[PDB]
Design a protein around this nucleic acid. Sequence first.
RNA 1: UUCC
Length: 664
Amino acid sequence: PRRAPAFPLSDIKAQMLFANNIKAQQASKRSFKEGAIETYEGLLSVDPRFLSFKNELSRYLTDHFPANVDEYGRVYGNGVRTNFFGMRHMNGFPMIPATWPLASNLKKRADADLADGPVSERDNLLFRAAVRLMFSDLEPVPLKIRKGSSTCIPYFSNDMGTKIEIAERALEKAEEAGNLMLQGKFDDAYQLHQMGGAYYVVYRAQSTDAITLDPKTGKFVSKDRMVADFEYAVTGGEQGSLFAASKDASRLKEQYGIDVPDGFFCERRRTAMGGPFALNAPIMAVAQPVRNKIYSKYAYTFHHTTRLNKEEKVKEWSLCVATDVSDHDTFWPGWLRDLICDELLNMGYAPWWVKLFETSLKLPVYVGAPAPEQGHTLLGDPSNPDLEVGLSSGQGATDLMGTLLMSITYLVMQLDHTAPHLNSRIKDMPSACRFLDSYWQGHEEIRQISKSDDAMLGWTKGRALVGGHRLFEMLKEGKVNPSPYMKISYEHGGAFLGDILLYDSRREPGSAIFVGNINSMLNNQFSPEYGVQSGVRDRSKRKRPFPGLAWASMKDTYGACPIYSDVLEAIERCWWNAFGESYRAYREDMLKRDTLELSRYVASMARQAGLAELTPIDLEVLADPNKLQYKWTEADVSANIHEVLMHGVSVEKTERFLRSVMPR
RNA sequence: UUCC
Ligand SMILES: [Mn+2]
C-alpha cells in the first residue's frame, strides 16, 4: 500500500512550511520539552505536599467509594464508575515516546474488519441524506476566532489583528486557491494563499488515565498506551512497531531531582493537530452555520446542555443504550470524506470550496517532538495531498465530521438489529431525507442523542424495542461488533457528555437521572491539562483564564452526585493533612481574586460587580475554554462572556463569502 | 503553539 513520503526538517518541502519569522522557525525546531505544570498560582504539580495529598485522597476515596456499575455497564448507587487513582500522575511529564501519527489508516480499518465504503445502498442514501440535511439552507454568521490561538503553518502568529487579516484575506482568495487545487496546482495555492502545506502536530496531555492497585503486590499499575514508531506510521502498520509507551516516572528523580512517590506515573500524551489557518478559515465560515442549523432544527439529537436537558429525553425511552467507539479519529474513514464532497457537489456547493474541504482531510502532517532526539519530520507530500490519517483535530469541522459519521452509524445499527420494518421508509434520496429529518427530530420509535463518539441510543415502546434488548445483549456479550463502520461496544458506566446516567433498582430510563461525574470534578481541580500560565498577562489568551471561577459553579455541576458532600469533605480533610490549611478557604480566595480580575475583561459587569449575572456554564468555560471545544457551543454561553474568549471577522465579509459558496 |  505504498509507504508515505517523509522529509526531514532540513528538506525544502519542510522548510517551506515555516515562514521567515522567529515564531515559525522556533515551532519548526522545538525539541522535546517537559516539566511540572503550575497547577495553581504558586503550586507545582510535583509539590511534595500536593502529591501526598493526591496519594491519601485517591486511596481513601477508592477504598470508601468502590464503583457501582452493573453487568450491563449501568451505574447505580454511589454514582462512581471506577477507582480514583487516575489522579496519580506527575502532570507536565509525559509518557515516552508519544505516538507517530499513522499516515494511512486503510490497513488499520481493514484489519479491524471495518468497511471501505457504505455497505448497502440504504446506508449510502442515509450518509448522503445527512449531508443534505446538514449543509442546506444555512444562515451566514461571522467567523469567530479563539483569542491567543496560533495560526500554525506557515506564520504561527498569535496576534488577533494578524489572525483577522489572515482570515479575511483567506475568505477573499479561497475561490482562487480552490480552483488552483482543482488544477492540481497545490504548491501554487499554498505559496500564494497559504492554503495547504501541513497540519502541525502538537502533543497534548490527557492528565488522568487509568491506574489500578494490584491487591496481590500492593503495587500500582498504569494502563499501557500503545504507540507507533516512525516505520509503523509511514507504512500504515505494515512495518515497524506498535508498542507500549513508558509511563514510568522513576526517571524524574535521577533526571531532575524530583521525588517520585510510589504509584505516580508520567502522563498519557495524545496527538493533536494545528491546521494551517488560511485553509481552515473558509471551512470554519461554513461549519458554524452548519452547527447553528443542527443545534436548532435537530436539537433533539444534537443540542445538549444541562443534565436535565439530556434527562428529559432519555426519560421518555423504554431502553437506553450507552455506546462507546474505539479510537474514533484514527479510524474515521476517508471514504466518508469523499462521499461528503461528492454529495456537496451534487447539492450545488462551489467546486473550489469542496476542493478546499477535501484537501483539508488529506493534508500531510509535520511531526514535532514525540520524544527526545526524535521528530522534526514531515509525513506526506504537500505538492499532492493524499494522506489518510483519519480525522485531523485541527480541521475546521472535525466535530461535524465525527457527528455525521457516528449519527448515521448508530442509526444503521438500530435499523440492522432492531427496526427492519423501517427500511421501506428509505427508498431514495427524497425518502431518505424525510426519514432522517424525522429521526433526527426524535419523532421515530428509535432515537438517539449524540456528539461525535459519545451517544445514547433509545427505543420507545414498539416493534423495535424487542430488538433493542437483543442488541444490548449482543453488546454485553461483546463477541460481535454490531457495526460494519466503526468498532462499537457499550460504555462501562454509561455517560453522555460528562453526565453519568444514574439508574435506580428498576434499571430503567424512566426512573434514571443524569448526575455530574464526581471523578471529572477531581480531574479538573487537581489534574488540569495546563498550568495557569501566570506569565501571560492577557488572561483571555490563557488555556485556563480564570481558574478560581469554577468553584462558584461546582455545586451546580456536581451537586447531584450521590457522594458529592463526601468527596468535598475527604478533600478538606486530606488537604488539611497535606497543607495545614482549609481547601475551601483557599478556593474561596481564588474565587474572589478571579472574580475581581474578570471585571477587567467584561465591559458588562461594573468594575467590581459580582458574578450575579453569569451562568454555571459561563463559569466552567471561563475556567476551561476547552469545554467550549467538546462540551458546549457558542450559543450556550452568555454573549458578553463569549466575547471575552473570541473575536469575530466582519459579518459582511463572511456573508459575501458564504453566498459564493452555497447552492445558488 | 490547533478545532462549537
Ligand atoms: Mn458515553
